[PDB]
Amino acid sequence: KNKEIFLRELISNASDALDKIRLISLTDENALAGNEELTVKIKCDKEKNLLHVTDTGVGMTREELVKNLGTVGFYSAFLVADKVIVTSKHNNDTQHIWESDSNEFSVIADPRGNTLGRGTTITLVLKEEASDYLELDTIKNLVKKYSQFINFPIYVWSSKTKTVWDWELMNDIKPIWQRPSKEVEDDEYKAFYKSFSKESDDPMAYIHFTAEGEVTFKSILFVPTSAPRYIKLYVRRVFITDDFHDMMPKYLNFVKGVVDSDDLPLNVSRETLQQHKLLKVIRKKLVRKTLDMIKKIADEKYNDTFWKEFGTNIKLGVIEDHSNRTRLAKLLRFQSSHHPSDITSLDQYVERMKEKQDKIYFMAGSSRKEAESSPFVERLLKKGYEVIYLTEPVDEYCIQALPEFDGKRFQNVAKE
Template sequence: MKSVWGLALACTLLLAVLVRADEVDVDGTVEDDLGKSREGSRTDDEVVQREEEAIQLDGLNASQIKEIREKSEKFAFQAEVNRMMKLIINSLYKNKECDKEKNMLHVTDTGIGMTKEELIKNLGTIAKSGTSEFLNKMTEMQDDGQSTSELIGQFGVGFYSAFLVADRVIVTSKHNNDTQHIWESDSNEFSVIDDPRGNTLGRGTTISLVLKEEASDYLELDTVKNLVKKYSQFINFPIYVWSSKTETVEEPIEEEEAKEKEETDDDEAAVEEEEEEKKPKTKKVEKTVWDWELMNDIKPIWQRPSKEVEEDEYKAFYKTFSKEHDDPMAYIHFTAEGEVTFKSILFVPNSAPRGLFDEYGSKKSDFIKLYVRRVFITDDFHDMMPKYLNFVKGVVDSDDLPLNVSRETLQQHKLLKAESSPFVERLLKKGYEVIYLTEPVDEYCIQALPEFDGKRFQNVAKEGVKFEESEKSKENREALEKEFEPLLNWMKDKALKDKIEKAVLSQRLTQSPCALVASQYGWSGNMERIMKAQAYQTGKDISTNYYASQKKTFEINPRHPLIKDMLRRVKENEDDKTVSDLAVVLFETATLRSGYMLPDTKEYGDRIERMLRLSLNIDLDAKVEEEPEEPEDATEEPEQDEEEVDAEESETQKESTDVKDEL
């Protein structure tokens, strides 16, 4: 009985489903209010198919794409992709900019292309720059006088910025020495396969980006044009964008239209008709024309010598660069050579910008643009020009300026190290201009030329740096000197007794806890390294030994938390071994930061280890575990075996020689 009821229930449900299906087929629509439906919402089974059909290349249909992905050879990236991709996407690049068109962006070049091996090696290995390798192979071009500064790649991670805006990246490349291949990746793994379309590129590479949903706002043609003009306006290689424009053209009138016109005309205009028949019958029609539009037609005239550039070229460049209609009042074109070589053109507008004095000091000037190898880097400068010259417009371009990976900020460099020296902290904060002398010969020159234009040079790495101060500032300084007198005396008489001449409160430090300063006639850290590096230096020169043995002044920053805590500890217990070690570590660290060399690096390392043990609550007397020794028998057996083998080899060699003698 139960089986009968079950069969009946199943038939009823089947009938209900059939009836509902018939209703849907007849109606041809779906209920607007899904809440009224007794069935829950179901997953769209065709969404994957539609996505596959949408993600396709020219000449490949959805089935071919599916077949390619099934037969393609899968590879894993040559790095920890999950970590590296997160680093690239979230840290290395600050700006997420791209274009939008049919959710897929194609970038094509006619370069040398890549073989299958190069696709795997260059695109499958993160932090490997194919441009750097290519540049190394083309060093002979420089011998022939050709320039390779147009090659931009350096770090080997720029390509992966595509995953900022794309879920999938497809690279199609054709090299002269190989067939055309397709490289595809979703940032987790990549695949490479022969292109079934054959050679469609001739030679070169096409990068296709399947854009993310949140990147759809950038899918406007104007966005692409603006980005190209912003970052690559002065690239030597032409950059074209496939764009449309509306043109008014004249087309001949079709025969049917001409006949209709003739029927409506009267016979009285026979003469006029004969004249019209001699002329082509045309009409004006507006058509949408697609063509390649050149984006970087402006040439970087600053790369040429100023003598070769005509005045009209300067004026035309200024109008295009600044979007101004008037000619500039004045301009200067120059090349600066030194630690960093750069070329620049600066323009003074013919009229003052609107609101020049109303927004003085508050408005961020973006009139000076920095380029590296003709690629735009930034226009966010605070100290490039004085505030009273914020109306000056121009470009600065360098081929050797160091950049970080994102090419948005400067990288670590020798000059930047000099700018971050503790000696110039207060000077920069107060707005003083500092001359950075980074070459070994510079200090010799300053000693021989101590003044310029009636003003003496002041070495900020030595004593004698003084600032103008008000009465209130003077009172505050005297109060601090009295407050820190116990710490200063303790450093001079006990902790650093044999190392420093005196300890004083610093007026030049703002962020660093301390610094080591030479006397007015002593050696700076740079001069000390120079003198010790002299090949003829034997150590017997009396004057050299005198300067080298001079003690230096130890300056401390009374506002630094380390110095404040040291003062508290010294007041509590002057004989605290930990505080003494801390004082010595601070002194040795200041020695290094001030450019001097440590006489005993081993002692410095031991003190750092003691401080680390204290910070990690590890006993100072805790010993290093000894490595367990292996049994002697295990080491002797192989030696015996080797002796036996050697004996056997000697016997065989002896037998072979005996046979030769008999022969």
Template sequence: MLHITDTGIGMTKEELVKNLGTIAKSGTSEFLNKMTDMQEEGQSTSELIGQFGVGFYSAFLVADKVIVSSKHNNDTQHIWESDSNDFSVINDPRGDTLGRGTTITLVMKEEASDYLELETIKNLVRKYSQFINFPIYVWSSKTETVEEPIEEEEEEAAEKEEAAEDEAEVEEEDEDKDKPKTKKVEKTVWDWELMNDIKPIWQRPAKEVEEDEYKAFYKTFSRDSDEPISHIHFTAEGEVTFKSILFIPASAPRGLFDEYGTKKNDFIKLFVRRVFITDDFHDMMPKYLNFIKGVVDSDDLPLNVSREALQQHKLLKVIRKKLVRKTLDMIKKIAEEQYNDKFWKEFGTNIKLGVIEDHSNRTRLAKLLRFQTSHHETTPSSLEQYVERMKEKQDKIYFMAGTSRKEAESSPFMERLLKKGYEVIYLTEPVDEYCIQALPEFDGKRFQNVAKEGVKFDESDKAKEKREALEKEFEPLTTWMKEKSLKDNIEKAVLSQRLTNSPCALVASQYGWSGNMERIMKAQAYQTGKDISTKYTRTCNLWVTSLTQRNPAELTGCRSSGLDESGLTFPFNTIGLNSRILYLIFLSLVFSMYSLFESRNKMRHMGGYLLTEHVSHFTFRHVKSGLIGLIHILCTFVN
């Protein structure tokens, strides 16, 4: 049997009948009917726990019989007894044993004997009633070492043994002889143990709670030995009133992104009037804030509904909205140094996912983003800081994506930008490019992927005339590349304004994939078993080939393949030109971080070209390292 006793006001006989004897009063008729049906069908009734609120009759899930003894100041002590089918109320034959209050005795079912285990009871109290206003004690035992006087016979035997061992021992002083002799004995001691010794500090005004109290509460509440990065303590009023404390842990929980969006998150615990209700809420916080820990306590939510119905309660949507706003405010207030060194390293990916997923808070989240940029080698920069440093006539935020900062920096797309002093953001995480794509603009400035078309520079009238003259001069070549040589792989060929050292590059259209995005998409397709070949081919058709217009050696190379130096007009001899163009396109693929898209036949053709005299001195002098890598790739494919 399990006994639960309080020292409240108790109940009279009339109140016992009224409150416990009328099933409808407890709102449990549906519960009892459901339980009876399940028992008749041989089903377990344990799953009913929590579906009918905190009704008194839920005791019959684990008990065959419930006995309630109660003493009120205005009546004698009575006993109410029920087996769920009927009840009776009688005078307690034991008389007034309670003084005042109530004792509930549960005669447990055999299959519910686990609830008689002391540790089970303690864990249940700590989980569900840790923060209620009244103290809860459990009658429990512990082993203590105590001093007990030695019996007379034991004392005589000890003295004889001691005398035999050492007759020459100096006699003790008289005052020591007068002291009673004792021995240490381990005994089992029974006493009341306080279970809910942690106070609900969220019920106190925030200004009255010390910083050390927040840290101590967090460690106990979350079972985390590290101090939190930050916390926020607030009371929300309006459509729903609730109190809450939210914490940012010092490190990301293990497996933070495992089963992202589907894995249960039990870091936010919901209380109603200090009674724990549940932590099994998938929508209490958005997915990207799945690292936030805290408590929410409201007096406005109902206790007499199932937890399933509570999850759909309209007030929870209001609570969620306010929790997100307060969380973002808390993150925003973290000091810059601590933000970069601690928070961003642990939870930066979460903020990027938030930009993608949370449209209503996208502007707030964008201000929390940090990226490596060409401005500083190690210190990340916010978008606000980037905009403040923008050049006078710069109207776009430039970014370059790659697997690492080093790869992004060495891209041919960076050459002209860095030479002209433009700052470029480096995107090195797979989620980064998705994040930026979800942001149409920041502070009125649109984003520009430097690996895509659309990068423009201010130029003088003289420079513009020179560029237009070169475009006209090379129009036969670029047209031939687009319509003949590379018609299946590119959308157009143009002379480049963005290259200074590299001979060529492949530029994606505004809606195509950059080399970095192609790598990510192909990796995802490989993991899921999907085929993206159709989409990949369509993307290839949107590539733009850029030939440097500032490299005389390259121009000479094109002419030496059969073009007329005086006019570059059709018809011209294309012998050798296809091989040279093919070499350029393969270099472009490597430089622009795209994968090689052609088959073995063209690989062999390219390999043959590399071993002939058509490879000029310019090729080895300017792109030696890239050529060595390309030969290695080609040999691998040929073999």
């Protein structure tokens, strides 16, 4: 019922094959000698009932083709095809052909020899009910749709008017995080987020900034709509990794998105890159702009959505991140005696204090009902003070890591 997905899936891998050979060509001087271009080339063959999707990517050795495909949403190609033919050429091997009707497979050396130079061609023998993917206009439309966020030129063999056939580019190789913000539509920012985590729901909030200073990088970060129960780094526009975990601190692990330095050493090992001094700088900047992004959330939306998902994170942040402790404190929310259910900020608490009250009162409990029914609060409430209810186990350690807030010291009502 959603068969078209196949072409997104094919395009998706082509891009990863292209990203793989690129990483290689950072340490390997020869990598691209087999074929100088880095492109995805899609061709129709209506008369032969075929669909080709050719990447000048990393390619596959004979041993790889057998293992990687015989023993990756990919296989979705069988939704539209009776037979799938993978013709590949890797730098460490001679050209090969893998073919399958999904009942078995066979890998033979390519009789035509090295026709590809380097890369892969996925040839689909299309089903009699998928004859619509032979039409140029259907294909262009699909390609263009799934092209949007690919950073590698995608061409389709098309006609133009007498009749001339040629490669027609389908997308903008120019990444969106490299575009000026004023020119980026809010739809795009959202799509781009979907196009690298699926779930296909708007992100709770995105920030898009270009960093000046000790290090220079463009970036987009996102706050996911639900706490998952992550960051792709690029150097001079060349994909490097996402296995970088010390990117963000622990309490901010939920953040997703891209960082695109032009200052980092491009032609290094990922070992070397990770211990690089500039990363700790790039880290600092990202946390600050994440906490900026979080601040910018609409006041109602913050208490109702964000805080429900990531409240604990923020509470953890106050504990870990001493250098942002104040920026975080202002993001904290709690229940309090001021209202049955609504959560209140610490600033909102202060605004409400009595003139000679210099202590922020809190009662710790296991649940709200426990803490509010406490005998300690009785006198405080009756004399019109407000008491914060700490009901999560992290809360008391949060508050315990917070000396003053706005010149006010905290006070455990259950204590002297």
